[PDB]
Nucleic acid binder design. Structure first.
Ligand code: MG
Ligand code: MG
Length: 117
RNA sequence: GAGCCCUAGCACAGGUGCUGCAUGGCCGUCGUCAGCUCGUGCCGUGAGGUGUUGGGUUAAGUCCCGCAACGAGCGCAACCCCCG
């Protein structure tokens, strides 16, 4: 239901293209490829989802980010489907640290929206 | 008696005499070449860098694509005149 739904095909990826700080999450090497251990994915999903839940049930807002082409279409769907914002194409330099300045273009976007009709 | 005009005296005028390395103003010139910058972010101990390195395209930093940058300004172009 959980970790049987995950073993679906939704774990193990890379192949000694690894960052060795991620060893605490790794189970073994099946066939040249690192197999991430789901019994510990279990663990972090509970902790992360606890933190997400909390966040939501108090007016919290979560910027979803994923630009790589496998996730592009997923992140937009799920993001619209929660009314949270998403970054999908390029992540622009300073969307956060320069948010003051980048927003000024959201304000331009809507003011150009306003010359549609 | 005030304009006004000559005589002498007083202040002063006059100087195309010097310095264009004391200057203003205006002009030439590189060059109508495609450049030169800024605000915030980010990188760097720092000068500084990114933006404005790359690929394409244009008469052009013109436009596109890309990208720790997102924008903007002086330029380019347009707004002006002539010719068709
Ligand atoms: Mg001079
Ligand atoms: Mg001389």
């Amino acid at each position: 239901v959980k970790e049987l739904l995950e073993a679906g095909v939704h774990f193990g990826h890379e192949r000694k293209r690894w960052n060795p700080k991620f060893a605490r999450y790794i189970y073994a090497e099946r066939n040249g490829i690192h197999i991430i251990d789901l019994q510990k994915t279990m663990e972090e999903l509970e902790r992360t989802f606890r933190f997400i839940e909390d966040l939501a049930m108090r007016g919290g807002t979560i910027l979803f980010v994923g630009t790589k082409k496998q996730a592009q279409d997923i992140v937009r769907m799920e993001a619209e489907r929660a009314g949270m914002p998403y970054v999908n194409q390029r992540w622009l330099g300073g969307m956060l640290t320069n948010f003051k300045t980048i927003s000024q273009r959201v304000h331009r976007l809507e003011e150009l929206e306003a010359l549609f009709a």
